[PDB]
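For reproducibility, we list the full input for the 028 complex.
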Amino acid sequence: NKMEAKIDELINNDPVWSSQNESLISKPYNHILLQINRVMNLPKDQLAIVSQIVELLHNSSLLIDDIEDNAPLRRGQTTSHLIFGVPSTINTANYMYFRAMQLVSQLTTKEPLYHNLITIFNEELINLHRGQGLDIYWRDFLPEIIPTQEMYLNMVMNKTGGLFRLTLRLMEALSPSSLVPFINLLGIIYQIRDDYLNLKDFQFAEDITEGKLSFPIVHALNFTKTKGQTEQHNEILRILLLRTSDKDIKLKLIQILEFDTNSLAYTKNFINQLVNMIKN
Amino acid sequence: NKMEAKIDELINNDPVWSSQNESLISKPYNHILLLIVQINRVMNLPKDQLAIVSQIVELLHNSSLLIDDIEDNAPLRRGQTTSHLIFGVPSTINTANYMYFRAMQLVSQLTTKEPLYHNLITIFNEELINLHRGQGLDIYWRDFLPEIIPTQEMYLNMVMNKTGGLFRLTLRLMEALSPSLVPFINLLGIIYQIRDDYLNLKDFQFAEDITEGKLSFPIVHALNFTKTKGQTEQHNEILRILLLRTSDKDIKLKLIQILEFDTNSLAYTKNFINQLVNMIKN
Ligand SMILES: CCCCCCC(O)(P(=O)(O)O)P(=O)(O)O
Ligand SMILES: CCCCCCC(O)(P(=O)(O)O)P(=O)(O)O
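The corresponding predicted structure, in tokenized form, follows.
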């Protein structure tokens, strides 16, 4: 009857999707929205698409990161998952990873080069997830595994390194005219400095509430272990396992790192040495 | 300088990742581990290629299920506790997304010919975009109810994107490799989804679709039917029960008997399914 006819039109056409449907799906993403080329020389408009790709990937990974860390704030406003819900926020971020994958074919149609660009995109997203996976495992299975400094730096080369290397590698492949080593050291300085300032700025220090194995915390645990300081080693673990928002307890942990282990000075010195490798 | 030398070797090499590290982040996926052949008797693909299409579709389907269960707050899958309740929502979201990109990587094992490779990756990308558009609408309607009450036509379009996505992904990759069945695979997909919604209630008559608050095919028919017939009290009671997110067995049976005797949504759904099967069989 009339029904068969409707079904018939439906199954012989592409799936139906409107601009109004698209706006519903983008609500969690729009909420978060609120120089190297001097060397590579890419045509200003090819340069725009790379910029759109990087922005899509960065903002989407942040939406997922805030759910994985149970975070209340980002860029000074309530997090998207607390407004639209965890379900809609996961699906929207994941949708945008595939929208970014689609902009790659707009960079070129040369079949050989296209394949290399997709391989770069695939490899670095695999590295970002392997690094984020290990950082989460250490935090959520604590005190099963306490990483060493060497293990921490390998995690950062995967995690933080992934999107820095992604941006740089796409640009070098497209250049009409390798700084990877330089971009790798830049990502390492950036991550250790972030961990350092999260504590020094407080002195909200949310890395303590989250129980993160940050660069300063890694130094402190291995220092107390090496010197046989049993009670202090254990006190650091107890406070991290509390998942606390209590300002007085966070200050107590910060005091151990400053007065017992000298971990803040140690980290300051480490960052300085890394910066010097470039300045000399 | 012992440092500077170490730092220099680190930045001049690829990132370090061990087999022990691979095993730790695979825990959520290994836990869930515990149509193609048919179709092939038309496409005639070689067995080596057929096996690769199969690993790809399995990777994508199982990873999708890990995320769907978080999105639905589901306590059980395949008779066992869900991965997010065992390993935590954080590791489970990360591991599922990691596997989406490992599946992408497998596509390059299907051929060494550049033009064919570009078509396979395009098909992959198109159907994952469609899967996410349909799941996005299904989640929005349920989480923001009663802001939007979908009609039968809006539901069917949501299913063509969602359930149609994986059925078309399998068939389209096979057709691209053969040395169209799409309309047929679209209808099989619609039949599959409406039958799943129907049986979840009929079997109870644990009807977890009710606990979840889902705008299922029978619930969509009931809300529009009560609106059309002016049954204001019954329309509002259906909404109230879905918004409770209840596990009470008497409350779930009360709603199913409203669809059986008051709106006749269960009989409507059974006949709708029969008519779609006839369009095929006949
Ligand atoms: C999976 C993307 C991770 C992006 C960074 C997340 C952080 O948790 P971290 O880099 O300090 O570990 P944030 O930059 O939000 O503090
Ligand atoms: C993005 C999720 C794809 C798989 C969904 C399967 C179901 O979510 P559906 O019945 O809602 O289509 P399930 O019956 O496993 O909950």
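The beta strands of chain A are 73-74, 77-78. Residues A 61, 65, 69, 128, 132, 135, 194 surround 028 (ligand 1) (CB under 6 Å). Both points were considered when choosing residues for closer inspection.
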